[PDB]
RNA sequence: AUUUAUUGAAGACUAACUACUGCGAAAGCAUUUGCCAAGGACGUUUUCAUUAAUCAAGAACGAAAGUUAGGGGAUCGAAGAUGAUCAGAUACCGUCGUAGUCUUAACCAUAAACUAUGCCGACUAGGGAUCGGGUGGUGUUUUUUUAAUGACCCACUCGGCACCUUACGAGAAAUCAAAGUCUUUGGGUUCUGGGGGGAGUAUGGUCGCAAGGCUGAAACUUAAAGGAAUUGACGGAAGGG
């Protein structure tokens, strides 16, 4: 794998067997429920919620905890973002890029790792406006994606 | 070969030795020893003034031969020459530096070389270009055969060794930097600095250029030769 | 045929390897496919040691080392009988003797 | 060896393999209840953590970040949940 | 009780250097060199053109008033050979048997930090 | 003059450390430090949920030499000027030396650009080293004798650059842990070849200021050209008797 490099790394997170987890945990759905639409309330992404919930609450993933993901909760809560995480930080790292470009062009390390950079935009964008997540007209293009981050 | 030469000149003698004199070369005050040896100039005739030929002159001299023992012997004084008064004439520090074959035989492969300098400037207003090198060993039970250091390491031990130099010479004079380059306590200081980031054996002190000299100022210069 | 599974250098993962100079006739090799050794001598060559030993003005004198790292090409490493043509069983050989 | 049972590894050599590469994945890491000094107030923490965990009573930090598991503060008592 | 000059040998390749000076290295005394003592380009760079050159070296520095020497053996050095010619340990000894006294022998040969280029071309000295 | 000493200027390079070691898509990358973005592996009871593999068209980078226009021009040095060697020697050797070598803004787009081994995936033998991360060990050592640390040691694991031994197997062999799982012939996909010359030539396009790059035949000619090993013969190759 890893299709924008030669690396081919296994390391990923092994979750458990059991579905309904972890009976040393007393707490209620409503309670991290509240908890999640609370961190998102001060503007925090799913990882960082999750991120969260694991190390200072005792919250082993939201999905078994409650009965949904956290993306889903923070649709029906109405707290979804624009356009989707990984979208974001892709065009996030995109935008830094260019701002180095400009400053120094004698990068060409940098100018390679841009097209890099804007070619997993262009496949991400493809498949999240082929789901229908992304209004079709959609489109990444440079001046638009310096505002589009704010 | 003695005869192939075409014209000496394209153009077309008197004893040189006899019109020169010796002068006996004093070290500082910060040195075991003074008498180091004798030099030469011309007599200082009406028109040369023959003290002011011989203001100049560096010698580099061991430190062996400087301190009396032989556990310096690996290390070189230069001595410049300040002021001549009556044949004795009067000496300062101009700079130390190692041997070549001291550091050709520290230098092995096998293990990291590690190297430091700082251009800080002493009390008396000299400034100093002071070089540090130390190299990297294996811990006894060390059973892998090379002992490098991680690239991070070295950075901060290059840190360290720079802000040890840049302390010490600060608040030290150049009469003190001698008196404390002479007992190797900056190698100490150093390795007391550096056994908790890497082992770090070999840890001398390089050569110290001066690299500008303030005015003359007398007084200081005759403080030395008591 | 291919005569050494090492190419006759020893360079697996650059792809470029910055060349030296043959001490012995100024051509330029990799530093990789080089013949490098060690001349460690003493200046004194054991035969004047006796001389200069008793001409000192110092007693216990060290008799100080040279030391240099010899870089070579093939041609004239060959040349120099330093390295020598060996049997196809005897070139997988890595110990020096 | 050609014959052996796969369906049945012993313990010790299932502990020894990778987490993904045993016969069904499952983590390694674990979950603590840590206790910090003064207030009772316990608090359960991550084993590989990546944030500076601290609890609600007060700034008694309880773990630091680090690449593996995360380093517990001194004074500290935690007991594997 | 001793007075020292130094002795400065410049041992390259085609010919041999033998050069006293006082210690602090400015005043000359007897720079005689190899081919200064043969009749052919040959053997300039010989040892027995080195001895004969150490040894009227000698000589004039004795009759000087120099006693003792500190050597300094050199090669040409930059990006040329490094190592010492064959004059060097000739001329060494002969200053040791002549009856001056000895010191501190030094290498002083002029090592590089990555000199500019050798010369001879990329395929190097063809012949 | 050469040689010695004290300083100064210039431009280039980054020795020793330097290795069957590291990073980079390749070309390539070695003084210190600061800034600017980037990246792999590891860890992970975070998050999305098929978003993927390979790739005509099209695109970014691409050693050296070369070109255009400025700067800079220390060293080496195509051409050239010369001194030898030689039958001849505008070659090898020696002394100089222009362009170049360095840099900025543009081109060029080739190399034995090589591991002469396309990329992705699964499975099939052992072994010991090492590089990066993690885990475990009341393990040594340093420091506040006790602590974390750091550096080592032992065991395991993930990812890497490689190496050694077998020959399950493969192969024409040399050899190969992939060049195996291929007549018991089907995991996915892209590119190239079809006897040797003529020939990477003509011609037509197309890119380039040029030098040239990329595409690219035929008439005709030929019975071999070639690969890997074997035994001799020879060597201005190394040893022995
Ligand atoms: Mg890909
Ligand atoms: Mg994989
Ligand atoms: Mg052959
Ligand atoms: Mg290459
Ligand atoms: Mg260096
Ligand atoms: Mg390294
Ligand atoms: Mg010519
Ligand atoms: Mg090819
Ligand atoms: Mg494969
Ligand atoms: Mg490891
Ligand atoms: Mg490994
Ligand atoms: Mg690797
Ligand atoms: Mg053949």
Same mark, same amino acid.
């Given at each position: 794998?890893?299709? &924008? =490099?030669?690396?081919?790394? !296994? ?6 067997? #059991? ?8 707490? #209620?759905?409503? #309670?991290? !429920? ?22 200072? &609450? ?6 078994? !905890? ?9 649709? #029906? ?5 624009? !356009? ?7 065009? @996030?790292?995109?935008? =830094?890029?260019? @701002? &180095?470009?400009?400053?120094?062009? @004698? ?14 935009? &262009? ?22 994606? =310096?505002?589009?981050?704010? | ?226 | ?97 | ?34 206790? *910090? ?17 601290? *609890? ?26 | ?7 400065? %040998? ?74 010492? $010619?064959? $004059? ?13 006294? %000895? ?25």
């Amino acid at each position: 794998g890893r299709m &924008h =490099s030669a690396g081919k790394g !296994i390391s990923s997170s092994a979750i458990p067997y #059991s579905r309904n987890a972890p009976a040393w945990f007393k707490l #209620s759905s409503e #309670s991290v !429920i509240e908890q999640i639409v609370k961190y998102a309330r001060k503007g925090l992404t799913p990882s960082q919620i999750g991120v969260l919930l694991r190390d200072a &609450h005792g919250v082993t993933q939201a999905r078994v !905890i409650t009965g949904n993901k956290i993306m889903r909760i923070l649709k #029906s809560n109405g707290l979804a973002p624009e !356009i989707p995480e990984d979208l974001y930080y892709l065009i @996030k790292k995109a935008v =830094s890029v260019r @701002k &180095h470009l400009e400053r120094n062009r @004698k990068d060409k390390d940098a100018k390679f790792r841009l097209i890099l950079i804007e070619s997993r935009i &262009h496949r991400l964008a493809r498949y999240y406006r082929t789901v229908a997540v992304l209004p079709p007209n959609w489109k990444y293009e440079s001046a638009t994606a =310096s505002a589009l981050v704010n | 070969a003695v005869g192939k030469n075409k014209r000496l000149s394209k153009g077309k003698v008197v004893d040189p030795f006899t019109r020169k004199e010796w002068f006996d070369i004093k070290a500082p005050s910060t040195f075991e020893n003074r008498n180091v040896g004798k030099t030469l100039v011309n007599k200082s005739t009406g028109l040369k003034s023959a003290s002011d030929a011989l203001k100049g002159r560096v010698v580099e001299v061991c430190l062996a031969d400087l301190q009396g023992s032989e556990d310096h012997s690996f290390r070189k004084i230069k001595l410049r020459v300040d002021e001549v008064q009556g044949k004795n004439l009067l000496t300062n520090f101009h700079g130390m530096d190692f041997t070549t074959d001291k550091l050709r035989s520290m230098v092995r492969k096998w293990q990291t070389l590690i190297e430091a300098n700082v251009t800080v400037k002493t009390s008396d207003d000299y400034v100093l270009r002071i070089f540090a090198i130390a190299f990297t060993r294996k811990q006894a039970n060390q059973v892998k055969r090379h002992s490098y250091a991680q690239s991070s390491h070295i950075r901060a031990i290059r840190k360290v060794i720079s802000e040890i130099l840049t302390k010490e010479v600060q608040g030290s004079t150049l009469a003190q930097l001698t008196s404390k380059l002479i007992p190797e306590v900056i190698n100490k200081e150093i390795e007391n600095a550096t056994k908790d980031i890497f082992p770090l054996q070999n840890i001398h002190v390089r050569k110290v250029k001066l690299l500008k000299q303030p005015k003359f100022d007398v007084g200081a210069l005759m403080a030395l030769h008591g | 045929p291919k005569k050494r599974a090492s190419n006759g250098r020893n360079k697996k993962g650059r792809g470029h390897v910055k060349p030296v100079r043959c001490v012995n006739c100024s051509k330029s090799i990799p530093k990789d496919k080089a013949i490098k050794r060690m001349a460690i001598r003493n200046i004194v060559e054991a035969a004047a040691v006796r001389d200069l030993s008793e001409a000192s003005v110092y007693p216990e004198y060290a008799l100080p080392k040279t030391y240099n790292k010899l870089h070579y090409c093939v041609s004239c490493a060959i040349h120099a009988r330093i390295v020598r043509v060996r049997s196809r069983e005897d070139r997988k050989n890595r110990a020096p003797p | 060896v050609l014959v052996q049972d796969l369906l049945h590894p012993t313990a010790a050599s299932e502990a020894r393999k990778h987490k993904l590469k045993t016969l069904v994945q499952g983590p390694r890491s674990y979950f603590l209840d840590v206790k *910090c000094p003064g207030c009772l107030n316990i608090t359960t923490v991550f084993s590989h953590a990546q944030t500076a965990v601290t *609890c609600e009573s007060c700034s008694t930090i309880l773990c630091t970040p680090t690449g593996g598991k995360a380093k517990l503060s001194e004074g500290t008592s935690f007991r594997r949940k | 009780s001793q007075v020292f000059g130094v002795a400065r %040998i410049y041992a390259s390749f085609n010919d041999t250097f033998v050069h006293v000076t006082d210690l602090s290295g400015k005043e000359t005394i007897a720079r005689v060199t190899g081919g200064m003592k043969v009749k052919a380009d040959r053997d300039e760079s010989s040892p027995y053109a080195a001895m004969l050159a150490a040894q009227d070296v000698a000589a004039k520095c004795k009759e000087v008033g120099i006693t003792a020497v500190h050597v300094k053996i050199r090669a040409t050095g930059g990006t040329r050979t490094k190592t010492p $010619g064959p $004059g060097g340990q000739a001329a060494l000894r002969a200053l040791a048997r002549s009856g001056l006294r %000895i010191g501190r022998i030094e290498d002083v040969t002029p090592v590089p930090s990555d000199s500019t280029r050798k010369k001879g071309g990329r395929r190097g000295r063809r012949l």
